Design a protein around this ligand. Structure first.
Ligand SMILES: *[C][C@@](*)(=O)[C]([C][C][C][N]C([N])=[N+])[N]C(=O)[C][N]C(=O)[C]([C][C]C([O])=O)[N]S(=O)(=O)C1=[C]C2=[C][C]=[C]C(N([C])[C])=C2[C]=[C]1
Length: 265
């Protein structure tokens, strides 16, 4: 079912996180967008699998207004481009994006895609493709809760390249007091956003854990009820790993109902 995984101690540290086997987060999904008339794919963003034919992703990831049949959802993959053996692939049937996505503030950064399969089922559950558990509407994990995010994004802001292997990073949910515009260069922070990041620093330069460009649409999960539960979606942030500066995620809880209604048969 959900929030289950055959984890493994990741071994290959990286500036920004540490390398991790897809098996560790079997709900991680790679969304590839193609260019003008089949010249090739391109890593666009990440996806959180919530059901056999429904993946959650970031709203801003689709600013480009892609034609439905121009995105491909790939699951069960450890390497961004190197085809995994147990990987599963699906074409995008259709995809919604929050009707109020304020592009200026990433307000309401969330979108849903529907996997194209001639049947009411697409992705068959497996050890490399499994669904995450949505948060219960009443969930409210404590301050600084130890959570962990994953994706195929960049290893730092200015890097012209995406990670050839699924990176994983562990962070702490921030207290409401710190998740405010004052802490984030005056930029705006709405009540559908949540901050979480690494709290370490000081030592003569460190590689702090945090998502980065390419990581959007990915998950920010936390253990809850012995399972892994989606708490936030990777939305935005001041660079990648800045001292004292958290990353901003989407409160999955707030959009529970939107995620619900929007799945209409
Ligand atoms: C779509 C997703 O891959 C990413 C995820 C970013 C995750 N970052 C993190 N630290 N966890 N989404 C985005 O990149 C959305 N855009 C941003 O987050 C931008 C990136 C630009 C940058 O390098 O600062 N940051 S922003 O907060 O929305 C923004 C920041 C900023 C800072 C200074 C000056 C300006 N201008 C141009 C006035 C901006 C503008 C926007």
């Amino acid at each position: 079912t959900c929030g289950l995984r055959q984890y493994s101690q990741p071994q290959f540290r990286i500036k920004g996180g540490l390398f991790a086997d897809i098996a560790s987060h079997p709900w991680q999904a790679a969304i590839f967008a193609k260019h003008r008339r089949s010249p090739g794919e391109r890593f666009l963003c990440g996806g959180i699998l919530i059901s056999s034919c429904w993946i959650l992703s970031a709203a801003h990831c689709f600013q480009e207004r892609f034609p439905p049949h121009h995105l491909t959802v790939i699951l069960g993959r450890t390497y961004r481009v190197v085809p995994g053996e147990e990987e599963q692939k699906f074409e995008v049937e259709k995809y919604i994006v929050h009707k109020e996505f304020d592009d200026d503030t990433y307000d309401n950064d969330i979108a849903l895609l529907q996997l194209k399969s001639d049947s009411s089922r697409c992705a068959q559950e497996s050890s490399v493709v499994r669904t995450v558990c949505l948060p219960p509407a009443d969930l409210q994990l404590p301050d600084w809760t130890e959570c962990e995010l994953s994706g195929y994004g960049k290893h730092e802001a200015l890097s012209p390249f995406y990670s050839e292997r699924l990176k994983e990073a562990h962070v702490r949910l921030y207290p409401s007091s710190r998740c405010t515009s004052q802490h984030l260069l005056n930029r705006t922070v709405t009540d559908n956003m949540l901050c979480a990041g690494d709290t370490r620093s000081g030592g003569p330069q460190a590689n702090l854990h945090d998502a980065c460009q390419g990581d959007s649409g990915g998950p920010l999960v936390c253990l809850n009820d012995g399972r892994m539960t989606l708490v936030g979606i990777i939305s935005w942030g001041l660079g990648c790993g800045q001292k004292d500066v958290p990353g901003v995620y989407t409160k999955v809880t707030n959009y529970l109902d939107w995620i619900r209604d929007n799945m209409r048969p």
